[PDB]
Amino acid sequence: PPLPDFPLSRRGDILPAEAERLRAEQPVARVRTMTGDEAWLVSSYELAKQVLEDDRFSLKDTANPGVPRQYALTISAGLRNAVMKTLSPQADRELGGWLEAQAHQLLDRLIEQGPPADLRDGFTEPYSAALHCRLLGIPTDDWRRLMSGIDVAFITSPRTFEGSAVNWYKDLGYMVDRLNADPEPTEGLLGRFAELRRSPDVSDELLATVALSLFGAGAVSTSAFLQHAIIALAQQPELADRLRAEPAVIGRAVDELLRYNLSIGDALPRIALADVRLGEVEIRAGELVLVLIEGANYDPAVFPHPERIDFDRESNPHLAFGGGQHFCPASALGRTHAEIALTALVEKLPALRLALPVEQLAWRPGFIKRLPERLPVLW
Which spans of this chain sit near ligand HEM (rule: CB under 6 A)? Answer: 52, 59, 87, 135, 214, 217-218, 221-222, 225, 268, 320-322, 326, 328-330, 333-334
Quick one: 75 or 362, whose CB is closer to a copy of itself?
A: 362
- Is 221 one of the binding residues for ligand ADE (CB under 6 A)? yes
Is residue 368 part of the contact set for ligand ADE (CB under 6 A)? yes
Residue 266 interacting partner from ligand HEM, ligand ADE, a copy of itself, none (CB closer than 5 to 8 Å by kind): ligand ADE
Q: Which is nearer to ligand HEM, 167 or 261 (CB)?
A: 261
Shortest spacing between CB 372 and ligand ADE, in angstroms: 18
State which residue, 88 or 235, has the beta carbon closest to a copy of itself.
235
- C-beta of 67 vs 152, nearer to a copy of itself: 152
Least separation in angstroms between CB 132 and ligand ADE: 12
Using CB atoms within 10 A of its CB, is residue 36 exposed (0-12), middle (13-18) or buried (19+)? exposed
**DSSP string covering 174-214, please?**
HHHHHHS-SS---SHHHHHHHHHTTS----HHHHHHHHHHH
Other beta carbons less than 10 A from residue 280's beta carbon: 8
Sheet holding 353-354, edge to edge: 117-118, 376-378, 353-354
Work out what residue 364 binds among ligand HEM, a copy of itself, ligand ADE, none; the CB cut-off runs from 5 to 8 Å by kind: a copy of itself
Q: Which helix (H) or strand (E) holds 288?
A: strand 288-291
By CB under 6 A, the count of residues binding ligand ADE is 6
CB-wise, 28 or 130, nearer to a copy of itself? 130
- Comparison of 255 and 379: residue with beta carbon closer to ligand HEM: 255
Taking CB positions, which residue lies at the least distance from ligand HEM?
A: 218
161 binds, among a copy of itself, ligand HEM, ligand ADE, none (CB under 5 to 8 A by kind): a copy of itself
Closest distance of CB 275 from ligand ADE, Å: 25
Q: Quote helix, strand, coil % in the chain, to nearest 5.
A: 50, 10, 40
Query: One-letter amino acid identity for 107?
Result: L
Q: Restricting to residues 248-267, name those near ligand ADE by CB under 6 A.
A: 264, 266
Please state, in angstroms and rounded to a whole number, the distance separating the CA atoms of residues 378 and 350: 10
**Which of ligand ADE, ligand HEM, a copy of itself, none does 95 bind, CB closer than 5 to 8 A by kind?**
none
- Residue 369, strand partner residues: 264
Q: Which is nearer to a copy of itself, 273 or 378 (CB)?
A: 378
Using CB under 8 A, list all residues that contact a copy of itself.
113-118, 121, 144-145, 148, 151-152, 155, 157, 159, 161-164, 166-167, 170, 173, 354-357, 360, 362, 364-366, 373-374, 376, 378
- Contact 271/290 with Cβ under 8 angstroms? no
User: Amino acid letter at 290?
Assistant: L
Q: Binding partner of residue 334 among ligand ADE, ligand HEM, a copy of itself, none, CB under 5 to 8 Å per kind? A: ligand HEM
For a copy of itself, the closer of residues 38 and 121 by Cβ is 121
Q: What 3-state class would DSSP assign to 263?
A: coil
Smallest gap from Cβ 214 to a copy of itself, in A, equals: 21
Taking the CA of residue 290 as centre, how many other CA atoms within 13 Å lie in the half-sphere pointing to its CB?
A: 28
Minimum distance of ligand ADE from residue 153's CB (angstroms): 10
Residue 86 Cβ vs ligand HEM, minimum distance, rounded to whole Å: 7
The least distance separating ligand ADE from the CB of residue 112, rounded to whole angstroms, comes to 30
Taking phi first (over 0 means left), then psi (-120 to 50 degrees means alpha), and beta for anything else, what does residue 323 get? beta
Nearest to 226 by CA among 327, 311, 335, 117: 335
From the list 330, 32, 72, 23, the residue with the least C-alpha distance to 189 is: 330
Nearest to 149 by CA among 169, 134, 130: 169
Give the helix ranges, DSSP H, for the chain: 17-25, 45-53, 79-86, 95-113, 125-136, 143-153, 164-179, 188-196, 204-235, 237-245, 250-260, 293-297, 331-348
